[PDB]
Design an enzyme around this catalytic site. Structure first.
Site, mmCIF file in Angstrom:
data_model
loop_
_atom_site.group_PDB
_atom_site.id
_atom_site.type_symbol
_atom_site.label_atom_id
_atom_site.label_comp_id
_atom_site.label_asym_id
_atom_site.label_seq_id
_atom_site.Cartn_x
_atom_site.Cartn_y
_atom_site.Cartn_z
ATOM 1 N N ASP A 103 -7.999 -0.296 -5.016
ATOM 2 C CA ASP A 103 -6.977 0.127 -5.897
ATOM 3 C C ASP A 103 -7.744 1.106 -6.987
ATOM 4 O OD1 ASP A 103 -5.781 -1.840 -4.425
ATOM 5 O OD2 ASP A 103 -4.515 -2.613 -6.041
ATOM 6 N N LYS A 169 0.199 2.938 -6.898
ATOM 7 C CA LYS A 169 0.274 1.638 -7.754
ATOM 8 C C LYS A 169 0.632 2.240 -9.140
ATOM 9 C CE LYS A 169 -2.887 -1.782 -9.236
ATOM 10 N NZ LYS A 169 -3.993 -2.805 -8.922
ATOM 11 N N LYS A 208 3.017 0.161 -4.804
ATOM 12 C CA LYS A 208 2.860 -1.214 -5.630
ATOM 13 C C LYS A 208 3.089 -1.256 -6.868
ATOM 14 C CE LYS A 208 -1.416 -4.179 -6.779
ATOM 15 N NZ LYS A 208 -2.620 -4.618 -6.213
#
Length: 250
Positions: A103, A169, A208
Site C-alpha cells: 500500500d 486507496k 480500497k
C-alpha cells in the site's frame, strides 16, 4: 439479526485488518494476526509497517498454520516524500521479508504544490514499484483528504492508474480528513475514465476505502458505491472494524 450478521461476515472478508501505530510491538502484531483469523470469516489482509512483515511471515505463520490473510505492507508512508531509490529499496526488502501486497503513498504534496510535475512523478514512482510486483497487488494511497478537490483527486487517480496501480486507496488514516462519499465518487469517475481508455483493464482495478471506517453501516455504504458505479476489487482499511464485526456475528 441475521441480516446484520451476514453483512458483517461479508465485510470482514473484504477488510484489511490494520495496525499502524509506529511505536507498536510484536505483541500488538500478534494480537492483530490472531484477530484476523480468530473465528470463521478471516480478514482479507493484515496491514502493517515494513518492520513487522518478517515477524508475520516467520513467527506468525509458525504459530498459525496456515495463515490465510495476505500480508499488506505500507510504503513511503504516511508522508509520501521518500526518494524513488529509498521506496524501491524498502519495497524490495519488504518483498524479501514476505509481503504479499504493497500500500504505497505517492507524493501528494508535490501534486498540490506543483501539479504537472507531481502527476508525472506519481506515475513514474507507481510504475517503478509495480515492476517489483508482478502478480502482486499494488494499492496506491492518494490521500484524498489532502488533495481535496475533484480536479486533483481525478488527475491523481488517472496518474497512478497510468503507472499500473492495481488499487486506489483513499487515505493513510494519518491526516484529519479521510474518505467521504464525494471523494470516493470522484475516484470512481476517474477509474471509469481510465477503463474507457484502457478496455483491457476492465474488472482489473480495485478500490480500497480507508480511514475513519468503524461501523458496518458505513462499510456497507462504500461497498454499495463501488457495486453500483464501479463494478480482489474492493477492500476496507480499518484498525477497528473487524473487532466490532466479530462481536456482531457472535
Amino acid at each position: 439479526n441475521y441480516t446484520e450478521k451476514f453483512a458483517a461476515w461479508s465485510v470482514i472478508c473484504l477488510t484489511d485488518h490494520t495496525f499502524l501505530d509506529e511505536n507498536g510491538t510484536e505483541d500488538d502484531i500478534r494480537e492483530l494476526c490472531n484477530e484476523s483469523v480468530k473465528t470463521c470469516p478471516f480478514a482479507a489482509a493484515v496491514c502493517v509497517y515494513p518492520k513487522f512483515v518478517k515477524f508475520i511471515n516467520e513467527k506468525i505463520k509458525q504459530e498459525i498454520n496456515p495463515f490465510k490473510p495476505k500480508i499488506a505492507c505500507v510504503i513511503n508512508f504516511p508522508y509520501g516524500t521518500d526518494s524513488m531509490e529509498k521506496v524501491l529499496n524498502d519495497t524490495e526488502k519488504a518483498l524479501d521479508d514476505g509481503a504479499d501486497e504493497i500500500d504505497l503513498v505517492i507524493n501528494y504534496k508535490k501534486i498540490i504544490e506543483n501539479t504537472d510535475e507531481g502527476l508525472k512523478e506519481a506515475t513514474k514512482l507507481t510504475q517503478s514499484v509495480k515492476k517489483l510486483l508482478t502478480n502482486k497487488i499494488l494499492k496506491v494511497i492518494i490521500e484524498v483528504g489532502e488533495l481535496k478537490t475533484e480536479d486533483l483527486i481525478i488527475k491523481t487517480t488517472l496518474a497512478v492508474l497510468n503507472g499500473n496501480a492495481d488499487f486506489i486507496k483513499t487515505s493513510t488514516g494519518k491526516v484529519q480528513i479521510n474518505a467521504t462519499p464525494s471523494s470516493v465518487e470522484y475516484i470512481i469517475k476517474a477509474i471509469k475514465e481510465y477503463i474507457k481508455n484502457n478496455p483491457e483493464k476492465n474488472n482489473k482495478i480495485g478500490l480500497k476505502v480507508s480511514g475513519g471506517i468503524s461501523d458496518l453501516n458505513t462499510a456497507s455504504h462504500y461497498i454499495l458505491l463501488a457495486r453500483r458505479f464501479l463494478s480482489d476489487n474492493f477492500r476496507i482499511g480499518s484498525s477497528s472494524l473487524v473487532i466490532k464485526l466479530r462481536k456482531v456475528i457472535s
